[PDB]
Amino acid sequence: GSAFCNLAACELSCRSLGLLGKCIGEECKCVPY
């Protein structure tokens, strides 16, 4: 908090796989959906 996530640098690790990029506490993952 609060805050230093580049969501556009997280999405480029998720968006081509058919799921959404997620970041919480500067930790980038993708959603389970």
Instruction: Give the largest CA-CA distance in the chain.
Output: 28
- Cα 21–Cα 1–Cα 16 angle in degrees, nearest 5: 10
* Discontinuities after residues in the chain (C–N over 2.5 A): none
Cα gap 29→32, rounded to integer Å:
10
Cα gap 26→16, rounded to integer Å:
21
Cα gap 17→3, rounded to integer Å:
26
Distance in angstroms between the alpha carbons of the first and the last residue of the chain? 26
Residue 10 main-chain phi, psi, to 5 deg: -85, -45
Least Cα distance to 5 among 14, 32, 29, 17 occurs for 29
Cα gap 26→33, rounded to integer Å:
21
